[model samples]
Target: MLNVLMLGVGQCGNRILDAVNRQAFGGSRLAKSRVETIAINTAINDLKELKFTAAKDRLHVPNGVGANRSKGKQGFWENQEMILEEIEKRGDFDLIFVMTSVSGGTGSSFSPLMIHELKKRYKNATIVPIAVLPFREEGTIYLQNAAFCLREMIEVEADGMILVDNQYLKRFSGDIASAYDRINTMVAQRLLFLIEALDSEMLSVTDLGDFKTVMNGGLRMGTLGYYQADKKSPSIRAAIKNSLREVGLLYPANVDAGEAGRAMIVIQGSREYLNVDEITKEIESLTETIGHVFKGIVIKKGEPRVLSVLSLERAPGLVELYEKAKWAIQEERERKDRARSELYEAFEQINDLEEIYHHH
Candidate 1:
């Protein structure tokens, strides 16, 4: 069995982790991959609302910090030893995953430091931090938080900082709640597929070693893509091709097959539906660009589905996020400064009036 330890640090993190935890239990994944999932948050209500992460695994480091990252930073600092002690009780783990949004208080401020600590504890362990990014219109403060949080994630050097951006995949739904639910479920499925394949026997297998090598490539950042043939008598070849397109992507990025450092494509369907030769050719096309492409075939009852995961040594999309975040930070600073100046000007007139006795 694969021993896995996971931490979901904030609301977004908790929800996604909860979804993943549920997937692990409902499917055969639980039989092969043993997981200990923890939901850590400063908000009691958020922790209480979780449906999957067990009550025993929930940790509340409440200091009522809200969205102020300065206080959020301290919360992690104080609980560093406490959390580590909790995980130590769980015994040895093969892999570690920490999920958090880069736009929040606890998750944003705590994740990098948390990873930094994990590295020191499990020096040889594979630690992956999945950093979920907020939409562009989420607001300036969130954008600024994402900017700084991402800066630290890279600086501290986690094994891989997997990218999950809401704006990048906004075409999935309409309402906000539905959109998030879909996104979280999609993430959970992809993660379970990877985890399961590592433990299962496959025609073309991708083990933990292969996964870590591919993930460690590029800028240590990557995203996922999935496409399932929904129509009657659907083509597996077509599904593989479409999975590489924008509509199937988990995050928005300019994906040139050649630009990706490495890739892992997992195809799941019945043997009759899977064309190994065709899948090999399509993956071969990517060999010109991607240095390594690990293909995994899973036999299951379903329409032909393809999942394309890759790491980019350089992604222009990330550069765009950085630019927008810088602009947001500047705009917010200007607005706050203007408000302070305007309030000061109003107070100046009051001071000059010198306690007018008109009322007296």
Candidate 2:
């Protein structure tokens, strides 16, 4: 089994890490031996509130004021030595996932820096970033942060960046908090599926090495999808198709399979229920459009379930994010300029006749 370490960069990332940890353990006391997890945050209170993360696994690395990306990066840079000390305890790993939200304080600023540092420290290990995008209406500031952080990770060129959008997933719940909870849990489950699928014994094997190639095939970015057979009657092919659908994707699949640079199709189910021929037919259909398809099959309980990973040359959702974020940043700048100009105008009236008693 390959050893993997998950480093959660801030409160958002920490909470998601907690969710992943919970999923990995499955309400059992049995710890995951192959996977090691850590939560790093700027707020002590945030770290204290986590349920699944251990005291030892939580590192409080506070720095800078609230929400300033440059200041946050500088603060983390100053404390790099201390952060490295905490990270060194993990020993060695084949892969490291630097998971963070791209629009928050510690996460937005520190994630890219952490990836750079991790790359330097572990030259052999692949460092992948799992970046969670903010809701579209979260605010102009968040949009700017997300825009800048996303670009930075891509520039760094460390393995691949996996994206999950809160805006897309929020439809599953009523409020932002509830949406976040469900979104985190949803991502956690699929991530665990991929990780376990990588390590598990399978009839049709997809090893970690093949996984790496698939990740590199596209633009060094990707998203995941998963579907399980429930009581609701649906064909296995429909389940496979559903996994690639918008609702099932971590990021919006604005383009179809033909546009994807590469993909991985993994099916898990009972041997009695799983039709290998059908699975082959479905995947062969996709292989034409996707350019390349890596296949894996695992035998387990219940009905047929499908998990699909897509690597894209370009994502329409990401393009939309860039355009909107550019507008948001410009709008903020204009708003600030207007506010300052108004303040100056108000001050001018008083300045013209500043102290009538003194003049007299």
Candidate 3:
């Protein structure tokens, strides 16, 4: 059994990570490992919102929110200390995922610091950072914060940093709310797929636990799916085109994994009228047509979402590289202090909102 520890801090981190936990079964990854998550944030409401949206068991929203600022070296130390204190009473883990936006309360400030400390304290674990990049439209403040946060994370010596870009979310359908839900659902599904593959028996592959260390190649990645041609029916290329409609980017574009690599499609849904047998045969035929496979993964849990992810293989920028140890510790301390002030003001606002709700 593997011990996986996932940490999501702040608003953006909590939301997406919550989504991951909600759609935790891509095919079947739920019962494979001993999974636990620790979420840190100044706004408990974010966690509350998550609870309303997903199951509450996987996420451990403990008390004690840290300072939320980038005051400097000493500040980071203080905040990191707070985080360590929280984890002191917990058990150990094999992998740790830090999910947070590039900037914001604890997410940006404490992540690098935590990584530095965790590596020191728990040497056996692989710490992978899945830091989210705030959508460019969020505002100038978030933009600047995202920029700086990226640089800092790199510096912290994280095993690898895989970014989730929100600005490039131009491939989905429907309104903004629906767009977010659709994107979130898709990403969640793919993660579950990989987790299940990593958790279950593979046709010819290792468990996901191996990917943790193999990520030394920066831990950055992208997922791809395609179908072959059907000689007597709608061509396999048509299936590939249809599949493209759901994905956001056609990157590492024009990938050729040899002349006859086969593809297998595992379609899952409760509402859609899908031709599973035909799809499978078509995919196998494709592998024969193409000598090598670029990528292949699928999960048929109860998800009706035609979703997936294309995780980029890249590291944080120059400034972000500074986010590693020593430096990150210094900054987290300062942020902790600021978080105190914001939490105080937020408490007042909460009281105000409570009174307003009481009257209604």
Name the candidate that leads on TM-score: 2
Q: 214-296, model 1: which lDDT tens digit per residue?
A: 78898888877788788595687778767767677777655663557888888888788877898889889877767889988
What overall lDDT, based on C-alpha atoms, would model 3 receive against the true structure? 0.53
Per-model TM values vs. the true structure? 0.87, 0.89, 0.58
lDDT-sorted candidate list, best first: 2, 1, 3
lDDT of 3 by residue, 1-360 (tens): 566677776666676677777776432353456666666665566666775243433333344433335542344465566667666556887667777767565677767777888888878776777766554445444555666676677687665564555545533544666656655555455545544444444433224434543344422433333232243444433554454332332222122332112222333333233455555564554454343222333433333223222332332332233333335455668789899989999999999999999999
lDDT-superior candidate, 1 or 3: 1
* Candidate 2: tens digits of C-alpha lDDT, residues 1-360: 667899888888999999998876762453322688899888888899899888999999865446789888888988888888888877887788888999987898898988888888888777888899989888877888888999899888788878898888876445767888898898888878887677675333224667777777778888888898774654678888888887888988743745578788888877876787988898888866678888888876667788888887878788888889899878888999999999999888777668754698
Pairs clashing within candidate 2 = none
Worst 10 residues of 1 by lDDT: 198-207
What are the lDDT scores of the predictions, listed in order?
Answer: 0.81, 0.82, 0.53
Top lDDT prediction, candidate number: 2
**Decreasing TM-score order of the candidates:** 2, 1, 3
Better of 2 and 3 by TM-score: 2
What's the TM for model 1? 0.87
lDDT over C-alpha atoms for residue 20 of model 2: 95
